[PDB]
């Protein structure tokens, strides 16, 4: 339907164990297509999806050049963060950044993102207007002033407006056969007794793409939100995802429950019940 591209950077310090480590991944929708690891024997921006491999020498040199610079830049940001927070050089800390572009179904730029975090909490984010920043604490304000002073926001907006949208349209074309096809889930309901009096019903969704899905348990048409146990949508390893929801029900009540599945691949949501044979 609507498509997006995101980049994820992670920087970790390892005091006394080696240099800080930098890892970058790129995705289009839920499909990872590139990787960089500063710890690789010979660090390189490598393909992780087949359709990206067509990209030329200028491209691959360009991104390896870029990612190695970024790793240096975040090694220094990690040091700077120590000043702002007055933290010791013995601790291990983590900086993260996620940024990308959303394209509306229409295909023009619909939204742009940039968010950064320190030790897993919000640090600074590019606002929706792509011109201003939101600082999480007084330390991030120090960065905020430097960045409006250096007009970074104008530079990242130039990226998301243009180069991000342009490559992501190019990728969507190259990866047409996988990126632009929705795989509906395969669904079935499972039963396991806990005891003679109670059993667990579990609703399964398998082999779907994209990852976005909703699973719901209802009893006599009313939501068992509070009593449903949900697991995080998980990768199958073949680029499709899985999920399940389960409830513990009194024996003999199994057919009052119905499992409802919503997925972009589905024409109409599915309603499932336990069917033993």
């Amino acid at each position: 339907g609507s498509h997006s591209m995101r980049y994820f950077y992670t920087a970790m310090s390892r005091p006394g164990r080696g240099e800080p480590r930098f890892i970058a991944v790129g995705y289009v929708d839920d499909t990872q297509f590139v990787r960089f690891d500063s710890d690789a024997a010979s660090p390189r921006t490598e393909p992780r999806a087949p359709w990206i491999e067509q990209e030329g020498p200028e491209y691959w040199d360009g991104e390896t050049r870029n990612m190695k610079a970024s790793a240096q830049t975040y090694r220094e940001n990690l040091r700077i963060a120590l000043r702002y927070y007055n933290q010791s050089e013995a601790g291990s800390h983590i900086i993260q950044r996620m940024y990308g572009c959303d394209l509306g179904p229409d295909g023009r730029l619909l939204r742009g993102h940039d968010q950064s975090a320190y030790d897993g909490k919000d640090y600074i984010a590019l606002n929706e207007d792509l011109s201003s920043w939101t600082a999480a604490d007084t330390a991030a304000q120090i960065t905020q002033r430097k960045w409006e002073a250096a007009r970074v926001a104008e530079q990242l907006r130039a990226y998301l407006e243009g180069l991000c949208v342009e490559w992501l349209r190019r990728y969507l074309e190259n990866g047409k056969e996988t990126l632009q096809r929705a795989d509906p889930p395969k669904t079935h309901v499972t039963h396991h007794p806990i005891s003679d009096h109670e059993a667990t019903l579990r609703c399964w969704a398998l082999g779907f793409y994209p990852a976005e899905i909703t699973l719901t348990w209802q009893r006599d048409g009313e939501d068992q939100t509070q009593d449903t146990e949900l697991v995080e949508t998980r990768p199958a390893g073949d680029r499709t995802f899985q999920k399940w929801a389960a409830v513990v029900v009194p024996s003999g009540e199994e057919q009052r429950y119905t499992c409802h599945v919503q997925h972009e691949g589905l024409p109409k949501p599915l309603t499932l019940r336990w069917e033993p044979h």
């Binding site: 980049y7 990612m67 970024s70 830049t73 940001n77 430097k146 960045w147 250096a150």
Partner: peptide, 9 residues
Amino acid sequence: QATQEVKNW
């Protein structure tokens, strides 16, 4: 394609 940084915190 990724974004060139090169801003420092």
